[PDB]
Amino acid sequence: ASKPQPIAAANWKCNGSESLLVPLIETLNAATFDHDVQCVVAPTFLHIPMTKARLTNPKFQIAAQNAITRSGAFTGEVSLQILKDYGISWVVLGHSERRLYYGETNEIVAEKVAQACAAGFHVIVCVGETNEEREAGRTAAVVLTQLAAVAQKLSKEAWSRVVIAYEPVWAIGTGKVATPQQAQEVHELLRRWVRSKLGTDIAAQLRILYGGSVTAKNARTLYQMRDINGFLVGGASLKPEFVEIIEATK
Amino acid sequence: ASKPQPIAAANWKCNGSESLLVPLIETLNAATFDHDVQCVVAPTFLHIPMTKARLTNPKFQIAAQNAITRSGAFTGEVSLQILKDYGISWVVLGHSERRLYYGETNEIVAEKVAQACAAGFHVIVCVGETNEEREAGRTAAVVLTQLAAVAQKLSKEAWSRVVIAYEPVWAIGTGKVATPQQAQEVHELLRRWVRSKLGTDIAAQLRILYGGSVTAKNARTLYQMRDINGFLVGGASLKPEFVEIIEATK
């Protein structure tokens, strides 16, 4: 069915400093987007306060790049509740860096999404297969297992609050730029699974963002793929050209 | 022989609300002490900007509860460089909870430590054995190995920026504090190993802090031990009680 509202998400990973982010916030604030788009910026936890105080572009929400499910005895971590008290209502969960370096299993990701959902958060749930998994011809088994692991914790009505980001981790970890066709190939199969398990309604309204290598140069040809509803952008989202990335979802 | 400057460090862990921390910080600002003590407060990353904005008590420094080096996965994480640029120059590293839930090995803690030191941080390096380790007669072996891993990535002139916190895992959030003697016995072990590697001057100057169910009701009896130089306080750090604990380092 016809495309739902696009999302342009920035993952500011753990870069930025007041020095870098201020001029970058100013640029996004000066930009006007005439179309229906939800922009999302995910600053590091430390930078979320200056981002919230400074960010004014009306299409934008501020996200967290991660979170744990409960407050209490967890040194170094930030909970969903603490984020929500602060007025943060978006969070990225399941990012490939978290799955791979930080021991976030399908179950761990799934449990965080279930809780963020019940805490009233919109969630960008990340999914993606490694080079080793792709080459074993296990792309579909892996992304659909990550996806079904999350769906098992949720009900029909959760999905108005869920967004999926496809991370082509096979391309990221091999220094490749996936093609619009490679991206679309996996977005299509994620959507086909959603359609069959949750409904055509759920499937039509679901945003599936592409979390590969996104530049002002490729943004528009990625967005013209049938099942791409936007982006989770890495490096380019810390640059003025993020404005042109947003524009490409028009 | 005589004890170096004590430290009273608050670990806020995964707790907070702006609603809670404003009055707390106001109290801390009004607290006045008659002896030389380094106070440290370690908010969540999300709460570090509010604390830096509001804390004026000049006996106090702000610490992060954790950080990564330049060579970690950044998503969800906050780097040593990012903190420094924020003006934060204290960091708690190797906390039990992170060694236990977030897979930080002895090597990883060591890297973070060495890196934090190179960047100008004062580092509170945490160590401590679990109940099962203690039961198997492994306390020394465990804590000296955790310590030794750190020590080997450092040089003699690093030690002026290092602080050990001994937290027996069995004393974290259990109401079971190490009797003065159980703690003394371990602080002694640690200092004595420091002395074998680094000599008289280093060993004498190093602060070893006790962590694990510190309250206003037990802190003074602990601080009386010869090898205890203050505290890393968890639940009680988020109460007016923490002032009384600082006073107990007199």
Brief summary:
Chains A, B: GO terms for molecular function: triose-phosphate isomerase activity. 2 copies of one chain form a homodimer. By secondary structure, chain A is α/β, with parallel strands linked by helices.
Task: Give an account of the 3D structure.
The structure is a homodimer of 250-residue chains. With 250 residues, chain A is of the alpha/beta class. Chain A has a single domain (1-250), classed as Aldolase class I (TIM Barrel). Helices cover 42% and strands 15% of the residues of chain A. Chain A is built from twelve helices and eight strands. Chain A has helices at residues 18-30, 48-54, 80-85, 96-101, 106-118, 131-135, 139-152, 169-172, 180-198, 200-205, 219-223, 242-247, and strands at 7-11, 38-42, 60-64, 90-93, 122-127, 162-166, 208-210, 230-233. Chain A has an eight-stranded parallel β-sheet with strand order 7-6-5-4-3-2-1-8. In chain A, strand 2, helix 2 and strand 3 (60-64) form a beta-alpha-beta unit. In chain A, helix 5 runs parallel beside helix 7 (139-152) and helix 7 crosses helix 9. The longest helix of chain A is centred in the last third of the chain and has 19 residues, at 180-198. Chain A is globular. Chains A and B meet through helix 2, helix 3 and helix 4 of A and helix 2, helix 3 and helix 4 of B.
